[PDB]
Amino acid sequence: LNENKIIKLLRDNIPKLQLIYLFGSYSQQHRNSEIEIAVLAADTLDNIARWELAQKLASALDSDVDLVDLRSASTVLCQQVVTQGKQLWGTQQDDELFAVKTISMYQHLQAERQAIIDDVMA
Amino acid sequence: LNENKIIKLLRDNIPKLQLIYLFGSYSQGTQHRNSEIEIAVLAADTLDNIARWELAQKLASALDSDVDLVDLRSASTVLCQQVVTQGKQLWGTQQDDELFAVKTISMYQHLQAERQAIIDDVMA
Amino acid sequence: DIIINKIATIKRCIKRIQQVYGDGSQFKQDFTLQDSVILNLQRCCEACIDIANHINRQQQLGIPQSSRDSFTLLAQNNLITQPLSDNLKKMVGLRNIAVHDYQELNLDIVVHVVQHHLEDFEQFIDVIKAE
Amino acid sequence: NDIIINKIATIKRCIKRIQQVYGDGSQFKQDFTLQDSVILNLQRCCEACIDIANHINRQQQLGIPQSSRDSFTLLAQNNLITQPLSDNLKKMVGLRNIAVHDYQELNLDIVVHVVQHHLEDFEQFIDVIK
Amino acid sequence: NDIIINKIATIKRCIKRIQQVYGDGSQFKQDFTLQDSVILNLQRCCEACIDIANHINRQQQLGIPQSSRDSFTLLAQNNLITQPLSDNLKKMVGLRNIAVELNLDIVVHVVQHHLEDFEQFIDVIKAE
Amino acid sequence: NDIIINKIATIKRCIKRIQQVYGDGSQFKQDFTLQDSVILNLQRCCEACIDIANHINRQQQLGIPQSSRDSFTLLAQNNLITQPLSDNLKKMVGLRNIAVHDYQELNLDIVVHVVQHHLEDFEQFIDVIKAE
Amino acid sequence: NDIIINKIATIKRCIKRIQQVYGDGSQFKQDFTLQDSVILNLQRCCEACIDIANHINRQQQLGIPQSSRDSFTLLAQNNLITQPLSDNLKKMVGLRNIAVHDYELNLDIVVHVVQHHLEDFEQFIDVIKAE
Amino acid sequence: NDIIINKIATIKRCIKRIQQVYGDGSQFKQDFTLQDSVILNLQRCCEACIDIANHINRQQQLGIPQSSRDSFTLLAQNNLITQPLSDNLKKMVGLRNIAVHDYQELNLDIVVHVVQHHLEDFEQFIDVIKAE
């Protein structure tokens, strides 16, 4: 997978970019699944502009792409990026700040919601 | 593509089978991708539609690929013409193949005269 | 204008079917009067197909994939009742046999249509005219 | 091939019916019943020749014609029938179309001239093919 | 694991929306939007099941699936699901092409007789 | 429903504690101890509401929250709360997330604006629920 | 060619059903049944365009497409579609994953596609209908 | 590490906030506001300790903490904190949960016992962590 092409396209199209992560199966090729990319910028991405940018990545990589805005993404998904993600760009300090905030929010979420998932998991 | 596996599965599962055709992309070079294997059969009776879909998925599992199984006895005239045109006969007598082809091409020629005005409309 | 013409030949063909058949009597025995009935039955069926196909064209109902499909398209857009769509497609099937392999045309079915199913042609032209 | 055998027998069976039915010819330009019989049996001759042509085009891999006229063109382009026969059988098909689907413009003089002078395109086709 | 959990929830949401939209079936064959909704939710169920199967194949190191159907084959070879349940889930993979007039009968057939297979799959998964 | 009534009482006591401690506001910004007490009871109100929402999410199987805010999204998705009210409670969760994880970045001016103008977003939520 | 013709007819039928189900938009936003119908019919449009492209790539012998998107770039490289239309149809390839993202966040995407990219399918079939 | 340094600073700031607000102790069990302020700064101390733990477990790939307490457990299994200090920090978190989320069941004397005798656990955790 061409990580330099992913980095250049995101840097050229996202203002105040701070973090780029590869997560999902490609961070672990595998199959027909999407390439999953997470970005953190100083502002939240416009939802439609994010989707358009994902397809621009999709065209350049000749593969399905899912672009995730970490600043609007759920705590569960942020926890997944933090746990399995491969950082492609951004300082190491910004990655550690993002991890600490994410892991803390997730632990507090697990407390609030653990009766719900116990109930759903029979 | 294993044609002998296709033949055995359909022979074992379709009573009074008469014709097996491979058509579409997998005949005339095989198209990789997620594209279905397209197979057409003629039996003495029309197949039950749901039993035919089940048989397709059983072929799909044996072939590790999506399969579309077409019953020629209820298929459209357009589709029968495509099978007759680009199809590769995998089983059945030459005479049953020619009976089906003559009937199909005739019906298709009469359909083309009937619907040429509709086709010219939607193509301009 | 085509529909008026086609409806006109359907009525005109139904009339010629009725005279030549007249009373059953001997139609099973003389081939020439069967040829007149069989041909005019085919003309009725094919005039109905072209009525259907004219409507399919101007209303952009779709592209028929078979002769029967001309009436299925009408039924899917509620321009004809589906029991009538089914009966007309039965006529298409007889048309298909009469033109492609005329010797397998069973005559007991031909006389079953002359006796009881000419009304399906008249019901079809009555519906199409009413729209 | 049984396909050709049955179509040929049909062509002969039907041209005899045209001749028996169009006897002296006096009862023809009036009397529509016998017109109907002649026109139908001419269609059955055309359809059987078209089936032969369709069958041969597919077997000899000449192309699949989507119209009956293209089918005879394909046999002429590959020299399985002479082009004089090709264009005359195309004329029969063209006349059937008018005779079956649009009598109100059928000349009927052309039918009668075909009944007496141009049936001999069907025999000629039967003889070539055989 | 959140992927397993969320896929299970997606499957149950889709099953209930199929049951709700299908209802008694009286209108189902007349409203193309009820058909579209049921088909799309059948495909979502099938995809979620493939994601569960692939997540399990990887995490427990069973093999690498070469297709969607192989995802279930790997589960059955290791007796995580039974061979008939595996075969029924493979059948559902074909629905990915059912959208692209008589296959309406297939959709009704699947609603009436194969919805239990998705529920049987997530029950086997819930019991780990 | 025994848990819901206990959470409702905790919100009401915490709302009064905030009003009591904030007073007229004239010393709120210079006494860190009054800031702590109000901020804490704001957090308790928010988290008691979250527990109420999750109790209903669990009882009615509305879904699995993917974040703390999502707990209120699920009730608004099923028309059990006002979309204006869901948005307000979720903003309150965001305030809570800052207060718990990185308290130094709390903006006292928004804390004051929530005490003066947004505490009865809690009160709207309490009554609506209760009239199940 | 009946494949090209039928795929074109499928695209138009799907466009018409997206328009009439979406309608004014007021209640599209919270009736999951209408959302499902539009998504599925968008996916059918996308699949039908890819099949048209593959058929042309084959019969024009333009090369074997290496992917769904490659099928359009092969059309663009031979100047049978413009580059921005090619790019717009590649964007639609992404729609096959819009149903299976498990997250409103995508429904703003769906309404965006309905309002601004639905014309891309219509543009494609008009370019093709030249032949 | 800048994250470790800032979290250390926060624990210190908040322990002094607890010692200053609790004073001599004569008014603590009476005044809800002083309890609120002590409880909140205990929470901030706990969150700063948990953030350090979560950071180190990820920085050194020791595991994924299944919970805030499990994050201390993982540090102890790697012998970066003692098993006794791990257990004390974990019951601090438990006291925080009671103090914040279920005050009506809080035993105010354990909070006082913690204010008097267990603030050293935070300082002991600081010293071990920075002695890396």
Tab-separated table of C-alpha atoms in Angstrom, chain B residues 117, chain C residues 1-10 46-55 57-58 128, chain D residues 101-102:
chain	number	residue	atom	x	y	z
B	117	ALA	CA	-39.668	1.320	-32.602
C	1	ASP	CA	-53.677	6.933	-35.290
C	2	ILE	CA	-52.005	3.516	-35.273
C	3	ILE	CA	-54.154	2.297	-32.384
C	4	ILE	CA	-57.381	3.234	-34.187
C	5	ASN	CA	-56.116	1.358	-37.248
C	6	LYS	CA	-55.017	-1.667	-35.199
C	7	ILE	CA	-58.308	-1.733	-33.258
C	8	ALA	CA	-60.085	-1.541	-36.618
C	9	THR	CA	-58.320	-4.624	-37.989
C	10	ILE	CA	-58.925	-6.530	-34.734
C	46	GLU	CA	-50.164	-9.374	-33.418
C	47	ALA	CA	-52.365	-6.276	-33.656
C	48	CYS	CA	-52.724	-6.385	-29.858
C	49	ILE	CA	-48.938	-6.677	-29.487
C	50	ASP	CA	-48.454	-3.543	-31.610
C	51	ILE	CA	-51.108	-1.673	-29.636
C	52	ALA	CA	-49.227	-2.642	-26.462
C	53	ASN	CA	-45.888	-1.700	-28.017
C	54	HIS	CA	-47.179	1.670	-29.214
C	55	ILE	CA	-48.331	2.475	-25.676
C	57	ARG	CA	-43.173	3.482	-26.551
C	58	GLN	CA	-45.051	6.722	-25.917
C	128	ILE	CA	-57.219	0.712	-24.506
D	101	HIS	CA	-49.960	-7.436	-40.869
D	102	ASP	CA	-51.445	-4.927	-43.316
